[PDB]
Write a protein that binds this ligand. Structure first.
Ligand code: HEM
Ligand SMILES: OC[C@@H]1O[C@@H](OCCCCCC2CCCCC2)[C@@H](O)[C@@H](O)[C@H]1O[C@@H]1O[C@H](CO)[C@@H](O)[C@H](O)[C@@H]1O
Ligand SMILES: OC[C@@H]1O[C@@H](OCCCCCC2CCCCC2)[C@@H](O)[C@@H](O)[C@H]1O[C@@H]1O[C@H](CO)[C@@H](O)[C@H](O)[C@@H]1O
Length: 461
């Protein structure tokens, strides 16, 4: 068939853009899609307005796509960012780069942020950050052990951290009398990150022509952002000019031939695609911990066994902490920072008892895979163990917080590194206890963030 989908009644003009609201709206989209999947099975499809797409929610369909993968996979078109690059005449980046052009840049970095021997080498820099972060932590801690604006806090950490990795400089976000251009560049990011959203459901080209107030905002946001990044990536190059092998950036710029104009673009989308996501999972892991004392116990122990005394962690030991590394796992399978990624076919393909029309929009509901009762017994349970007892099962195509395919998360490594170190110093110097036992809903706003302030307390030892 072709119209056997099935899916939710196709109600006039809107499509399912009805229930989607008469159920919570966009911020609860992941939930309702989760139900349809429960309903209409492994695969179906819906149309929000004139937007049509088919949802994939199974380990089968996932391999049944991984294998049929193309050389240049591609997700939805982020036209607004593209619009800006063309307008202002700037390069593109792995988020929007395409086909050959993409594959080129990917390879160059891809081969350096996903190679342990290299990533692990970030070792100290991260700790330097982790250091000042905790040093500031107890200061923010009141006496109940709580932090006001935790997310905001963890975001500062992840920002400051990744920029030490990218521009090789501290921005001073972790302590007063050190902000200013720190936050203008931050706002620029925050403004830009909300505005572009509006030129997606609306004709960016139309906007541009009318020079709409919104077009101008987004423009300026990015105009600024590129002005904050450029010099940072010019100092890093002028500094490791005659020192081959040293700077991973300067090495790409020279023996992978890429223009400063391309590096600027690539780095920036790296930062953008980094920070919040990172911070976001860090917070959900903490949260899950605060709700499972036993598992936090078995975790503390493993952090004392491998680190007797309050000594500083180091990339490596992680090899000796299978419960922690898998705590971060299960955490992501129960509370994913990212619910789903999207793909575009560029050749008709086979899925379900169906075959897709080529050029179709696919929404890989990588979330739902977490409750696949056939791969996860008691899906609604935080069990860092299932990922350890080597008697288990779990086909890699059931847990994919970083996306499947070769156009999957390029950060994954360095992300997990950071989410492994910080989490050591945390569970080290602090106990993580629940401030309360009342409901906390996940809300899609780019990445599942929580409905309210996280009810978790940081009591010292
Ligand atoms: C807990 C942290 C993170 C999660 C869960 C995560 C999530 C993902 C996911 C699910 C994708 C989509 C994959 C697909 O197309 O199927 C993605 C793409 C990507 N991520 Fe992350 N990410 C995180 C951190 C990082 C970090 C720290 C960086 C930056 C160095 C990074 C940068 C990117 C980039 C540049 C892409 C686009 C790659 C391309 O298609 O060319 N990520 N990420
Ligand atoms: O930019 C990330 C997300 O990507 C955006 O684009 C993809 C979704 C397309 C529908 C979005 C629009 C629907 C109605 C008009 C406004 C948003 C949306 O998810 C958007 O809500 C957006 O959420 C945005 O991220 C912010 C958090 O830093 C939100 O506070 C902000 O409102 C912004 O919308
Ligand atoms: O969260 C917003 C979107 O929600 C879904 O619908 C998006 C369009 C929203 C439909 C329009 C609604 C808002 C205004 C018009 C009426 C209702 C999916 O596309 C989903 O993949 C999602 O698409 C978004 O894509 C962005 C790409 O950067 C990311 O924020 C993220 O992938 C997100 O899912």
């Amino acid at each position: 068939n072709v119209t056997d989908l099935p899916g939710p009644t196709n109600w006039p003009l809107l499509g399912s853009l009805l229930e989607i609201f008469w159920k919570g709206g966009l911020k609860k989209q992941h939930d309702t899609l989760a139900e349809y999947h429960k309903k209409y099975g492994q695969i179906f499809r819906m149309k929000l307005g004139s937007f049509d797409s088919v949802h994939l929610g199974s380990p089968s369909l996932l391999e049944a796509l991984y294998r049929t993968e193309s050389a240049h996979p591609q997700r939805l078109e982020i036209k607004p960012w593209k619009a800006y690059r063309d307008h202002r005449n700037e390069a593109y980046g792995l988020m929007i780069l395409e086909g050959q052009e993409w594959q080129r840049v990917r390879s160059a970095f891809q081969k350096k942020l996903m190679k342990p021997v290299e990533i692990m080498k970030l070792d100290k820099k991260i700790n330097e950050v982790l250091a000042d972060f905790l040093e500031r932590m107890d200061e923010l801690c009141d006496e109940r052990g709580r932090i006001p604006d935790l997310y905001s806090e963890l975001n500062k950490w992840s920002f400051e951290s990744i920029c030490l990795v990218l521009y090789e400089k501290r921005f001073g976000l972790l302590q007063k009398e050190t902000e200013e251009e720190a936050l203008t560049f931050i706002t620029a990011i925050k403004t830009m990150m909300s505005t572009f959203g509006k030129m997606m459901v609306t004709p960016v080209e139309l906007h541009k022509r009318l020079n709409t107030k919104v077009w101008q905002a987004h423009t300026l946001a990015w105009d600024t952002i590129f002005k904050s990044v450029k010099p940072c990536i010019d100092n890093r190059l002028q500094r490791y000019s005659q020192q081959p092998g040293a700077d991973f950036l300067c090495d790409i710029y020279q023996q992978d031939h890429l223009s400063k104009k391309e590096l600027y673009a690539a780095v920036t989308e790296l930062q953008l695609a980094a920070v919040e996501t990172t911070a976001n999972s860090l917070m959900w892991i903490l949260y899950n911990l605060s709700r499972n004392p036993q598992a936090q116990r078995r975790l503390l122990q493993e952090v004392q066994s491998v680190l007797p005394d309050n000594q500083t962690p180091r990339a490596e030991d992680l090899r000796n902490m299978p419960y922690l590394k898998a705590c971060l796992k299960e955490s992501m399978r129960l509370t994913p920072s990212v619910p789903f990624t999207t793909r575009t076919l560029d050749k008709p393909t086979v899925l379900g008892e169906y075959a897709l029309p080529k050029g179709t929009v696919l929404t890989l509901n990588t979330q739902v895979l977490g409750s696949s009762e056939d791969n996860f017994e008691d899906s609604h349970k935080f069990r860092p163990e299932r990922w350890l007892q080597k008697e288990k099962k779990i086909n890699p195509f059931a847990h994919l917080p970083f996306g499947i395919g070769k156009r999957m998360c390029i950060g994954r490594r360095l992300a997990e590194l950071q989410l492994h170190l910080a989490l050591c110093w945390i569970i080290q110097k602090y106990d993580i206890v629940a401030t309360d036992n009342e409901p906390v809903e996940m809300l899609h706003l780019g990445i599942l963030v929580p409905s309210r302030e996280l009810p978790i307390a940081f009591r010292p030892r």
